[PDB]
């Protein structure tokens, strides 16, 4: 329900990347004390292939499903803000498509506004790929509530080019203008707001798709900041500082990449995986910041894991580290006590 | 052809009462529907009134439910204005228009016109000229020569410097042109208010004799010779003819005829006036009659020669074997293989006389509402126009030219009337222009800002925006969209093809056209200034004149590690996934230092294979995470750069001091191609990248924007593509880009960019830095078009250069000449940035995220299309709405499709006949998507359609694509949908294929009516969702989604649902109800009582 899902989102965010493998749900069940459902504490809960967790939000719901690799990711999600409906699937990547809500019984007047905020993306922001805003031909104003600093990941917001009858379409960002820089890749505009809010390196990207294709679209969008308003794209390009937007990590891959000297994994959606995830029947950890493989000792939420120097996989049994001896269970967690390695019970 | 007044009230239904703007729309639509095809101009104006009726209604009522339908009607209008102008097919007025305003007709131009005259003898030749415009060219040449001498003597102490920016010289020379032109216009104004009126030639004669040391008899002889030549070559006068009717057109024509000397814009305006007054076809002298398509039907195509240069070969061979045009220099044809030349000989000598060696079409089917225009680089070019007498679209072109010149004059006359220096009047003009700036016409004012500089200073191109192709493109946008006076709105190439000049009638790729395609840019300006300083004083005065020596200095690795890397300040901030073979080809210190600095930019991902000495080339890279230089063999890599995806070759050398230089680093295109082939063979054993890039760097190596196939980078790329695509695998032809820098730019400790001039050291020519960085694009082969396109420049980089110009102009320690030079450079930079948006030259992202978005748009477009022809099929043969189409069963039956429609009230099936095969393709795609959805649902219990959840991504994306397609079809609403109900048809098909057997086997009409009623009634959610918003737990057992079915079985207690859950799925649900428990307890008690009896 709303309260339990809010607590679950707090647990997911407070985790140190342990948020997508199947063992994560066992950790959550321990946290929520699901063993009290039966009465005894030694219950081993099995998170199987088709495990589904549906969490209700004050606006809508998000359904996560477990994969063939025993990984939990968003299978579906839908939330409505009385003016904009946001829907995420798994076949279109993990993309939140935000579209104006098509009111039935079209005899009534059709709204022109289309708002977006990072509030519903709390906790699940680590599963989202990108935000695709898809204004229809009736959309005239787009409100981008960028003032939400209590998240960890800010997906790129893609504003699809509207084939509309409106002379101008207003993109109103609830933020200042000195924070934003701009860039272009191909025929897309890019606005990047980088700021330091409570010692957080917050970086929010808003690209407009195909907006540089023709002057019909270039002169159609008007940017509205909180301090300066009615700015055209040419005004942004001539007055705002410009940066270079192309990066190697934003390409499309399906496996392991060795970019520079850091290894990344692109899942089925051709997006970087983050945290402790199961790959090829093995457990790997990717930094919840840089999304790169880390090898050695990693303290995930207080539990120590060891990841191989060479292959990066997690140790899942008796292991020898620098001559010393350590024991890990099948989940990769370091263990304390007397356990049987090949030499005996150490 | 538009929809009637009816069927729209059924479309634009809204809670608001019918407004008077909606009534105006309806009246305009019905008044258009009742009209005659005659007088297409008024047939056009009715549509051009209805369109703005709709636009006013939409703009006034933005939150209006009607605006949906009327937006689709406007789109229909957009597809109906094309139908109009397609009715008329009257033959064009048999006149060929040629224009030579000012000066005398060149014998080359006359020989070019001779082909049109002889071959197209049906059309008469009209070489337009003026009675009193013959000495304008002489005046322009005199003023530019005198100003060149004045500027050279003014900067005499400075031009001796090998590293001197010629833009300062061009600034002084333009100051002198503006002074002389102001003198001439003052003289013209003084001598024009005289008794009777002198001819313009008379004022020019007086001015040239009095100031420019000219003789009246020479001018008179030139005048009469030009008059005789033009008249003998079908000359038609303008002043002695009814061509200058409107005074505004005369003012704007004399604006460039004598005020500026810009006879190009004079041609652009007199051609429109000629095509409006009379009819016919206008052709620039450079154009030639087309060839027959089947004359060269064979395929001598080399596949190593550009498609445009293939047409150049065709024309060059045609006029070299059978000499038609004198001095047709065969510098391009006479280098191919001998067998190809022999084949061309056979083809040319196997044909009949000139009437069949060149095509000639009298079937020019145009309308009075239309003009035709040639195409170049995917954009309009007014090098060839077809229009009847007083064409309405031509009149739109004149109106666009008039509006553009109205704006230019409104903002320029206040600046030029006040007697001021060139710099001061340009400052005033720019201030007025940018104070009157608007979002709509920002690029227009950017383009027309150097209006006073067009034709005399580099990179000044305003004729393209006032009277050139920009005006025609704006007029085409006005015509298609029924707008008026649009300035920068552009038309997509798909909608621009209908106005194209017949491709068979034009041979655009002509020697004179190619010669004139060389724009006056920084590249050409460099050699023009070099020619000026060669004709003045003496000496080469070249950059390579400075101690260009052939030493063989090896790499001073200590110098690289102690002065180059430590002092590096350039930040890449890009991808850095590349191996950078810095193959320096010349041993002089000019290249050596550039090599060392470019290594210092990124020492780790870069290697030096300096070729100063032949048989010692070795990769001088950096040690792994160290401070040492490791030296492998030629073109070898540290073997840590194995996963690099890009190879950035940066050949360093000195190109030849010629415009469009043919030799770089003393090696021509073929020798450098062989060197790159050896490079590729050597690196094939080390690296197999994905994107190869050559970055030729050196003096006289520009990135030309026109005639790319004639350039050194263009020819180099055209050479090394087989070697790239064979030796290096996984490198398709379009991933090879070649650029051409001219200066090596570094960032010093103070943050000021400096260039390695040929005089040594690092001079800080800031204008040269920003011009060089601005003027560089990457030529790349386009396999989809077999042409050498140019990659989009770094628009953020160009804006960074513009911002640097802004801040540095803000500084007060800069010369006024440098101030205005940098202002002009910023103007050019922002004009290029605007051009990449105006010309549709920016490619989409093309990734997984965008492909799904783009594929959805393509699906929607095809959906709208199919709805359109199905509306067409439901208009004819009656059958309008209430006869839902059955896409499931479509029969080709011998190239005449028989499709079935199904009535709503009764299962009436009619197999109407259509010829279009698009219905079959769309039906096939719909059936495929419905089959995918059906396979995603392994079973249905009591019509509940238990989803079969797939955890693999491929099945998930397939199911989602099918669901998006079917749901988009189901929820479809459109202007055509009310009379079509395609959405209802697809919904019925989906319901039939899912809840029952396929629609192919539902011929039984009695239950078909029930199927129609039920399918329309309920909504089927085919989107992938585990829970359809129900707040319940989800039980997915090894694939089958059962939570909803179990919940509804345990709530409603449907006996059927229980039966199919037990049978099809194998699910038993325990009813914990107290009533069932009581019944079972009573059952067991009764059984115990009766069984124990023994009777
Ligand atoms: Zn040189």
Structure description:
This is part of a larger assembly, with two copies of chain A. Chain A is mostly beta strands and 346 residues long. Chain A is 10% helix and 34% strand. Chain A has helices at residues 2-14, 22-32, 215-218, 233-239, and strands at 52-56, 60-66, 72-80, 84-88, 95-100, 113-117, 130-133, 141-145, 156-159, 169-173, 180-185, 188-196, 201-208, 221-224, 231-232, 256-257, 264-265, 275-279, 282-286, 296-300, 303-307, 319-321, 324-326, 340-341, 344-345. A ten-stranded mixed beta sheet of chain A has the order 1-2-3-4-5-7-9-13-12-11. A five-stranded mixed beta sheet of chain A has the order 6-8-10-14-15. In chain A, a hairpin with a 2-residue loop joins strand 20 (296-300) and strand 21 (303-307). The structure holds zinc ion. Zinc ion (ZN) is lined by residues 543-544, 590, 654, 698-699, 758 of chain B. Chain A: It comes from Clostridioides difficile. Chain A: Belongs to the clostridial glucosylating toxin (LCGT) family.
- Biggest contact: A-B, 77 and 80 residues
Number of helices of chain A: 4
Instruction: Work out the strand percent of chain A.
Output: 25-35%
Assembly state of the chains shown? part of a larger assembly
Domain Peptidase C80 (chain B): 568-775
Protein name (chain B): Toxin A
Family (chain B): Belongs to the clostridial glucosylating toxin (LCGT) family.
Subcellular location (chain B): Host cell membrane; Host cytoplasm, Host cytosol; Host endosome membrane; Secreted
């Amino acid at each position: 329900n709303e309260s339990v899902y809010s607590s679950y989102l707090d647990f997911v965010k407070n985790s140190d990347g342990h948020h997508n493998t199947s063992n994560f749900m066992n950790l959550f069940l321990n946290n929520i004390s699901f063993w009290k459902l039966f009465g005894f504490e030694n219950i081993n809960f099995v998170i199987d292939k088709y495990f589904t967790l549906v969490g209700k939000t004050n606006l809508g719901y998000v359904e996560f499903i477990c994969d063939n690799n025993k990984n939990i990711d968003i299978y579906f999600g839908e939330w409505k803000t009385s003016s904009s409906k946001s829907t995420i699937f798994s076949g279109n990547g993990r993309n939140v498509v935000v579209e104006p809500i098509y009111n039935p019984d079209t005899g009534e007047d059709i709204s022109t506004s289309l708002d977006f905020s990072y509030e519903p993306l709390y906790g699940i922001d680590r599963y989202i790929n990108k935000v695709l805003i898809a204004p229809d031909l009736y959309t005239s104003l787009i409100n981008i509530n960028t003032n939400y600093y209590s998240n960890e990941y800010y997906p790129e917001i893609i504003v699809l080019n509207p084939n509309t009858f409106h002379k101008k379409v207003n993109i109103n960002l609830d933020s200042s203008s000195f924070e934003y820089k701009w860039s272009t890749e191909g025929s897309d505009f890019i606005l990047v707001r980088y700021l330091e809010e409570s010692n957080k390196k917050i970086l929010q990207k808003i690209r407009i798709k195909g907006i540089l294709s023709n002057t019909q679209s270039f002169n159609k969008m008007s940017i509205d900041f909180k301090d300066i308003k009615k700015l055209s794209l040419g005004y942004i390009m001539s007055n705002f500082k410009s940066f270079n937007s192309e990066n190697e990590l934003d390409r499309d891959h399906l496996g392991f990449k060795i970019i520079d000297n850091k290894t990344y994994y692109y899942d089925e959606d051709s997006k970087l995986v983050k945290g402790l995830i199961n790959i090829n029947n093995s457990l790997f950890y990717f930094d919840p910041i840089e999304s790169n493989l880390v090898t050695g000792w990693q303290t995930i939420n207080g539990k120590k894991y060891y990841f191989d120097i060479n292959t990066g996989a997690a140790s899942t049994s008796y292991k020898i580290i620098n001559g010393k001896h350590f024991y890990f269970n099948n989940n990769g967690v370091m263990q304390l006590g007397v356990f049987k390695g090949p030499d005996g019970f150490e | 052809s538009l929809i009637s007044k009816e069927e729209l009230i059924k479309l634009a239904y809204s809670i608001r009462p019918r407004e008077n703007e909606y009534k105006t729309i309806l009246t305009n639509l019905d008044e258009y529907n009742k009209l005659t095809t005659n007088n297409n101009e008024n047939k056009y104006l009715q549509l051009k009134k209805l369109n703005e009726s709709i636009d006013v209604f939409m703009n006034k009522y933005k939150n209006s439910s009607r605006n949906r339908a009327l937006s689709n009607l406007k789109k229909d209008i957009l597809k109906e204005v094309i139908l109009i102008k397609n009715s008329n097919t009257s033959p064009v007025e048999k006149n060929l228009h040629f224009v030579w305003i000012g000066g005398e007709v060149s014998d080359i131009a006359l020989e070019y016109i001779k082909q049109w005259a002889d071959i197209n003898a049906e059309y008469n030749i009209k070489l337009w000229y003026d009675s009193e415009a013959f000495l304008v060219n002489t005046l322009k040449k005199a003023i530019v020569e005198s100003s060149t001498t004045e500027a050279l003597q003014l900067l005499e102490e400075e031009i001796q410097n090998p590293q001197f920016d010629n833009m300062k010289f061009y600034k002084k020379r333009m100051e002198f042109i503006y002074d002389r032109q102001k003198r001439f216009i003052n003289y013209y104004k003084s001598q024009i208010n005289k008794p009777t009126v002198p001819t313009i030639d008379d004022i020019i004669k007086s001015h040239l004799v009095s100031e420019y040391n000219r003789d009246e008899t020479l001018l008179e002889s030139y005048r009469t010779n030009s008059l005789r030549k033009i008249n003998s070559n079908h000359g038609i006068d303008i002043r002695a003819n009814s061509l200058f009717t409107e005074q505004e057109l005369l003012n704007i024509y004399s604006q460039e005829l004598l005020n500026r000397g810009n006879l190009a814009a004079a041609s652009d305006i007199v051609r429109l006036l000629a095509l409006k007054n009379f009819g016919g076809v206008y052709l620039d002298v450079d154009m030639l009659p087309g060839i027959h398509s089947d004359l060269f039907k064979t395929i001598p195509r080399p596949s190593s020669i550009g498609l445009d240069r293939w047409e150049m070969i065709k024309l060059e061979a045609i006029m070299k074997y059978k000499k038609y045009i004198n001095n047709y220099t065969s510098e391009n044809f006479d280098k191919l293989d001998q067998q190809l030349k022999d084949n061309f000989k056979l083809i040319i000598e196997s044909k009949s006389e000139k009437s069949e060696i060149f095509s000639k079409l009298e079937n020019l089917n145009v309308s009075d509402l239309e003009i035709k225009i040639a195409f170049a680089l995917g954009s309009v070019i007014n090098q060839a126009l077809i229009s009847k007498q007083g064409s309405y679209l031509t009149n739109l072109v004149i109106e666009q030219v008039k509006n553009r010149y109205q704006f230019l004059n409104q903002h320029l006359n206040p600046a030029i009337e006040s007697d001021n220096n060139f710099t001061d009047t340009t400052k005033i003009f720019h201030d007025s222009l940018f104070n009157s700036a608007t979002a709509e016409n920002s690029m227009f004012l950017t383009k027309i800002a150097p209006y006073l500089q067009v034709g005399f200073m580099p990179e000044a191109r305003s004729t393209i925006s006032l009277s050139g192709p920009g005006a025609y493109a704006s007029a085409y946008y006005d015509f298609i969209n029924l707008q008026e006076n649009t300035i920068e709105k552009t038309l997509k190439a798909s909608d621009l093809i209908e106005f194209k000049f017949p491709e068979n009638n034009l041979s655009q790729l002509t020697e004179q056209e190619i010669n004139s395609l060389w724009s006056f840019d920084q590249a050409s300006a460099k050699y023009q200034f070099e020619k000026y300083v060669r004709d003045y004083t003496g000496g080469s005065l070249s950059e390579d004149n400075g101690v260009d020596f052939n030493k063989n200095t090896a790499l001073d690795k200590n110098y690289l590690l102690n002065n180059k890397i430590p002092s590096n300040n350039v930040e890449e901030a890009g991808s850095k996934n590349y191996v950078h073979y810095i193959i320096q080809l010349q041993g002089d210190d000019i290249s050596y230092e550039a090599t060392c600095n470019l290594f210092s930019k990124n020492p780790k991902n870069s290697i030096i294979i300096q070729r100063n000495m032949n048989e010692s080339a070795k990769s001088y890279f950096l040690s792994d995470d160290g401070e040492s230089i490791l030296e492998l063999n030629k073109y070898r890599i540290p073997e840590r750069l194995k996963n690099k995806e890009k190879v950035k070759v940066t050949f360093i050398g000195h190109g030849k001091d010629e415009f469009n230089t043919s030799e770089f680093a003393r090696l021509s295109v073929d020798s450098l191609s062989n060197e790159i082939s050896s490079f590729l063979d050597t690196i094939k054993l080390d690296i197999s990248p994905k994107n190869v890039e050559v970055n030729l760097l050196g003096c006289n190596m520009f990135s030309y924007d026109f005639n790319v196939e004639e350039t050194y980078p263009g020819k180099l790329l055209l050479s090394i593509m087989d070697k790239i695509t064979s030796t290096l695998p996984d490198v398709n032809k379009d991933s090879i880009t070649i650029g051409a820098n001219q200066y090596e730019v570094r960032i010093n400790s103070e943050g000021r960019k400096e260039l390695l001039a040929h005089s040594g050291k690092w001079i800080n020519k800031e204008e040269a830095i920003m011009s060089d960085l601005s003027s560089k694009e990457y030529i790349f082969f386009d396999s989809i078009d077999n042409k050498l396109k140019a990659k989009s420049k770094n628009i953020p980089g160009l804006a960074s250069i513009s911002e640097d110009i802004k801040t540095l102009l803000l500084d007060a320690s800069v010369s006024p000449d440098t101030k205005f030079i940098l202002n002009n450079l910023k103007l050019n930079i922002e004009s290029s940035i605007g051009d990449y948006i105006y010309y549709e030259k920016l490619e989409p992202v093309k990734n997984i995220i965008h492909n799904s978005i783009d594929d959805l748009i393509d699906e929607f477009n095809l959906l709208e299309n199919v709805s359109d022809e199905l509306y067409e099929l439901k208009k004819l043969n009656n059958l309008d709405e209430k006869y839902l189409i059955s896409f499931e069963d479509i029969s080709k039956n011998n190239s005449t499709y028989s499709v079935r429609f199904i009535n709503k009230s009764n299962g009436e099936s009619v197999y109407v006949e259509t010829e279009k095969e698009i219905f079959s393709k769309y039906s096939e795609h719909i059936t495929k998507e419905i089959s995918t959805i059906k396979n995603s649902i392994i079973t249905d219990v009591n019509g509940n359609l238990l989803d079969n959840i797939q955890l693999d991504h491929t099945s998930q994306v397939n199911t989602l694509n099918a669901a998006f397609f079917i749901q988009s079809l189901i929820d479809y609403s459109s202007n055509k949908d009310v009379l079509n109900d395609l959405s209802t048809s697809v919904k019925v098909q989906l319901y039939a294929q899912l809840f029952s057997t396929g629609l192919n086997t539902i011929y039984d009409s009695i239950q078909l009516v029930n199927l129609i009623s039920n399918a329309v009634n309920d909504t089927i959610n085919v989107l992938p969702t585990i829970t359809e918003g129900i707040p319940i737990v989800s039980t997915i057992l090894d694939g089958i989604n059962l939570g909803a079915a179990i919940k509804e079985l345990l709530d409603e207690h449907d006996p059927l649902l229980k039966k199919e859950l037990e049978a099809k799925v194998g699910v038993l649900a325990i009813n914990m109800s107290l009533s069932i428990a009581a019944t079972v307890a009573s059952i067991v008690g009764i059984g115990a009582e009766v069984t124990i009896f023994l009777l």
